[PDB]
Automatic annotation (TrEMBL):
Gene Ontology terms for molecular function: calcium ion binding
Organism of derivation: Trichomonas vaginalis (strain ATCC PRA-98 / G3)
Domain of life: Eukaryota
All residue ranges annotated as the C2 domain in the record: 1-103
Keywords: Calcium, Metal-binding
Cellular component GO terms held in the UniProt record: membrane
The name this protein goes by in its record: C2 domain containing protein
Length: 135
């Protein structure tokens, strides 16, 4: 009955993945290893993508669940090209609080920089208003 509200706000300091242009970045969110897998839109040709997209993900156990965030470059022939990732424990957010923070993405092998991503995260009972403190 707890919901993870995650606003994938923006990222910065992304790598130039190819000689032809800037990154076409999008983010994938996954709860644990479950089927709850969400994707943002692709922002074409920028190192500072701004998505400002909200996702509402039902949670299984707020003491152990993990959110994986995986930043990738849109498929241009070789599948989506991984940039970087982070695994965020759900238990580090006080229940009911709206937490707006930057996170350091770990670049995958062969990638020169991982980027930094801003997420606003709010875990609340599913009937509460998302992205407002649950007093
Ligand atoms: Cl182009
Ligand atoms: Cl939205």
């Amino acid at each position: 009955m707890y919901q993870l509200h995650v606003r994938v706000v923006e990222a910065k300091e992304l790598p130039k993945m190819d000689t032809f242009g800037k990154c076409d970045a999008f983010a994938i969110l996954q709860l644990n290893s479950s089927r709850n897998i969400h994707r943002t839109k692709v922002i074409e040709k920028t190192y500072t993508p701004v998505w400002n997209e909200e996702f509402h993900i039902p949670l299984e156990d707020v003491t152990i669940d993990t959110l994986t965030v995986f930043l990738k470059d849109e498929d241009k022939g070789s599948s989506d090209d991984p940039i970087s990732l982070i695994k965020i424990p759900i238990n580090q957010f006080p229940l009911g609080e709206v937490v707006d923070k930057w996170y350091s993405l770990i670049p995958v092998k062969g990638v020169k920089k991982g980027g930094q991503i801003r997420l606003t995260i709010h875990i609340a009972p599913l009937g509460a208003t998302p992205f407002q403190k649950t007093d």
